[PDB]
């Protein structure tokens, strides 16, 4: 006959939506230890033999995990920082001498008038008949808070490790699009290095495909899903801020000072970006090979834009400073890019919650790689704004499963009767 | 630092084995269910959320040890019974599955019948054998 | 307004004694391992989560509920150059767990998968007769 033998420790699993925990390698960065646990000793891997498993990067929750975490881990270092209400006054702002930088004047924000400031053009808004006068762009909307100056901004090579009873899986097939099953599967204790890099229209400091380029989308027979393309051979970018800046902290309200911009040592020159015009041309022609598969043959050339300056420009960070680059001229050997530096931003496009940038004195220049692009057809035109699909650029393999340990199977062994 | 290949079949390693073959890695799966390797290297320097995930993992563990305690099978890993099989669950015979099929597929044959198995193991193996004690 | 001397034993009282004198003392270190502004609660889970692990490893080895037990795993003389009666009559435990610290991982794998895994497939198939 067949008696049912209990088996504890059998390795099967469901799929579970659960909570992971961040592990960052290792001063006073917000990602250093006030969000995560310290340095990663070693990532592991066990590769599994005879196993098939489906995957999806659009029904995934790890990609929803950062968007529910970086919205708040960024927010943690914004509660104690200095709110700036009393600056919202009449802003008599006239042009700087050697007019996208305006010398402003306003009555005093004292602890006890006719004070002074000068700052960027894209944070003022015009008002009624007394011309050459302005106001901030968010007063009658919501609050505005400057960053604390002792706060870092560098994306850190994080490692999502996995908690108890939860194994992170990883497919390894080179021929893996955004969906479908996989065969060469493997289990890790912990993910590889991921850096939290914020970008529109592109993909900065990401990760490289295996000497190839493969676009990914789910409903690409719609205009619904964003066609996201990874790039082999990162294109190096150079972006500068040549204006040798000065700062000061003039007094704000009862017992506080407000970090603004002093005088611009060195005359007014536009901060721009560079890209080698040879490499960009060949790189697009790599993609249209793969576009031919989902279609001299360069039927696609066209660019579009329109709407949000977060989306119209090219938004990213550099040295703790936000950029907004014009990208129409680049799409269609160095290439100068007109790139704007706004100072009052919106953090993850949420209505109301605004953040003010620290005006850094001196000069700023940074360089970076590029591993991917953002496109929308109907021919392909660059999208931007959806922050979550930046995160899907990395986690297009992984998965979180819950271990069921326990199982049964019949056999020809019966429990002997106790005497 | 170097490292030679495994000769002891690490975590989830025999997931492709047959049911008569993956039984040799039952010990590795059970040990690392609880807390994994210990993370959080005493760095308490600066919440609430953290510890709910820590408390659930114990409750997942204590669910099963009590359930093996009712099933007369605490401490063991493999134990027999007095319950015969009912082939309406799955009539698939012995070597059709045993030396032919992994564990992920055997669970996808018995998942509809799961709670039905648990009452029968409870009653006719220990609620039964409580009436043999005397 | 109280006080009398020691009667049975103390907590960690045998931790300078020999193995042959500490082996009759294990219960006092066995009882008080578990019983004893959020930061009390974060202690009250780590004290649990350490107890289950040591309980779990005894469970896998066919040695749950006993304080001591034996296996059939052979001691390997490569692990210890110490003589037998030096161990049971001269060495304390605190010294002893600095000497076999490196080999400990080899030991625990060579209990489960060596024997108590193997003592179930052998055990289940002693039926049919």
């Amino acid at each position, epitope marked *: 006959q067949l008696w049912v033998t209990v088996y504890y420790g059998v390795p099967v699993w469901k799929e579970a939506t659960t909570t992971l925990f961040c592990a960052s390698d290792a001063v006073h960065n917000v990602w250093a230890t006030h969000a995560c646990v310290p340095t990663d*000793p*070693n990532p*592991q891997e*066990v590769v599994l033999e005879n196993v098939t498993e489906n995957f999806n990067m659009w029904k995934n929750n790890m990609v929803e995990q950062m968007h529910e975490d970086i919205i708040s881990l960024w927010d943690q270092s914004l509660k104690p920082c200095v709110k700036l209400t009393p600056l919202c006054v009449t802003l008599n702002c006239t042009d700087l001498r050697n007019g996208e930088i305006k010398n402003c004047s306003f009555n005093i924000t004292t602890s006890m008038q006719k004070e002074y400031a000068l700052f960027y053009k894209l944070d003022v808004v015009p008002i009624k008949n007394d011309n050459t006068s302005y106001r901030l762009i968010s007063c009658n909307t919501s609050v505005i808070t400057q960053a604390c100056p002792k706060v870092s901004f560098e994306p850190i090579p994080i490692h999502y490790c996995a908690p108890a009873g939860f194994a992170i899986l990883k497919c390894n097939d080179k021929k893996f699009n955004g969906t479908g099953p996989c065969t060469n599967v493997s289990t890790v*204790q912990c993910t590889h290095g991921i850096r939290p890099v914020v970008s529109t229209q592109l993909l900065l400091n990401g990760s490289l495909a295996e000497e190839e380029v493969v676009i990914r989308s789910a409903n690409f027979t719609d205009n619904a899903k964003i066609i996201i393309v990874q790039l082999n051979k990162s294109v190096e970018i150079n972006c500068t801020r040549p204006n040798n800046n000065t700062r000061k902290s003039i007094h704000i309200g009862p017992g506080r000072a407000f970090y603004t911009t002093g005088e611009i040592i060195g005359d007014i020159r536009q901060a721009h970006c560079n890209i080698s015009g040879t490499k960009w041309n060949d790189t697009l022609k790599q993609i249209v090979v793969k576009l031919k598969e989902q279609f001299n043959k360069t039927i696609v050339f066209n660019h579009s834009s329109g709407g949000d300056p977060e989306i119209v420009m090219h938004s990213f960070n550099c040295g703790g400073e936000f950029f907004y680059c014009n990208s129409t001229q680049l799409f269609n050997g160095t290439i100068v890019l007109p790139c704007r530096i706004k100072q009052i931003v919106n953090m993850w496009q949420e209505v109301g919650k605004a953040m003010y940038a620290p005006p850094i004195k001196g000069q700023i220049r940074c360089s970076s790689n590029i591993t991917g692009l953002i496109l929308i057809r109907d021919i392909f035109r660059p999208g931007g704004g959806d922050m979550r699909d930046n995160w899907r650029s990395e986690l297009y393999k992984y998965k979180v499963v819950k271990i069921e340990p326990l199982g049964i199977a019949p056999t020809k062994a019966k429990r002997r009767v106790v005497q | *630092a*170097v*490292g*030679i*290949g*495994a*000769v*002891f*079949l*690490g*975590f989830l*390693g025999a997931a492709g084995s047959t049911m008569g073959a993956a039984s040799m890695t039952l010990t*590795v799966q059970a*040990r*690392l269910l609880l807390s*994994g*390797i210990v993370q959080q290297q005493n760095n308490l320097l600066r919440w609430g959320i953290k510890l709910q995930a820590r408390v659930l993992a114990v409750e997942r563990y204590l669910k099963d040890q009590q359930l093996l305690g009712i099933w007369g099978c605490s401490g063991k890993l493999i134990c027999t019974t007095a319950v015969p099989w009912n082939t309406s669950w799955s009539n698939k015979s012995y070597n059709q599955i045993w030396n032919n099929m992994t564990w992920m597929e055997w669970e996808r044959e018995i998942d509809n019948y799961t709670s039905l198995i648990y009452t029968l193991i409870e009653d006719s193996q220990n609620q039964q054998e409580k009436n043999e004690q005397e | 307004a109280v006080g009398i001397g020691a009667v049975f034993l103390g907590f960690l009282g045998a931790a300078g004694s020999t193995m042959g004198a500490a082996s009759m003392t294990l219960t006092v270190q066995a009882r008080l391992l578990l019983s004893g502004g959020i930061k009390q609660l974060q202690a009250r889970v780590l004290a649990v989560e350490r107890y289950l692990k040591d309980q779990q490893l005894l469970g896998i080895w066919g040695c749950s509920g006993k304080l001591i037990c034996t296996t059939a795993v052979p001691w390997n003389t490569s692990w210890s150059n110490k003589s037998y009666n030096q161990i049971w009559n001269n060495m304390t435990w605190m010294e002893w767990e600095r000497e076999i610290d*490196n*080999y400990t*991982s*080899l030991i*625990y*794998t060579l209990i489960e998968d060596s024997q108590n895994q193997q003592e179930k497939n052998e055990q289940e198939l002693l039926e049919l007769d």
Partner: antibody
Amino acid sequence: RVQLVESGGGVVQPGKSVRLSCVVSDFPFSKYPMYWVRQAPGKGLEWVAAISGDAWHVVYSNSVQGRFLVSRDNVKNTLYLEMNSLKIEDTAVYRCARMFQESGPPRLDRWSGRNYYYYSGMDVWGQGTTVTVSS
Amino acid sequence: DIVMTQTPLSLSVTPGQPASISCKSSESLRQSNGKTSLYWYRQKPGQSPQLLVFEVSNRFSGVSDRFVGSGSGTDFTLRISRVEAEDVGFYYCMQSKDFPLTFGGGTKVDL
């Protein structure tokens, strides 16, 4: 003092195979990894090979795989390197090297089920020995 | 795999000099145990190599008190104050993060 002495030197023709020797002094040697380094006649230095104190694991460089063979004998306190299928451009001076620390036994990772030997830098060489491949 | 460089190698000296030579590598070679793999050796010409520094700012015992190296991450420097007449030879930088092991040219030192 740990006085590593090196011997077995020989100058031959290409296509042949020779073997060196490295003997130690005042030294337990059962728990110590060894190395082999290469001073080409005008060059700086480059690592060749490595062995455990167990003589269980042997890592090489990319080049001499399928040419060399390292083997300890802690009874003899003597290291062998039978260098099969010599090249002419591998004419150099070869040495042995005690590791800086004492290595230990492997510690088995409980999760991976996968051993890990530990190898660090070296501190004490021998006097040098000569192998030359010419015609 | 992982490689590294040195300074201009030939550096004539002065008795009582702050001599310093960097060795920038293509990796942050900090191991899992927090021990930074770095090994400064030296050979006089006609001699075997000889250990100077076994880890970042850790002189090897039995060697005199004038050899204070440093470094972190990619770049690693070896500062020597009180330059003497027994300093002639080459300086060998060494990785120990992962096999294979590398070295450098060996910075020439004369008067």
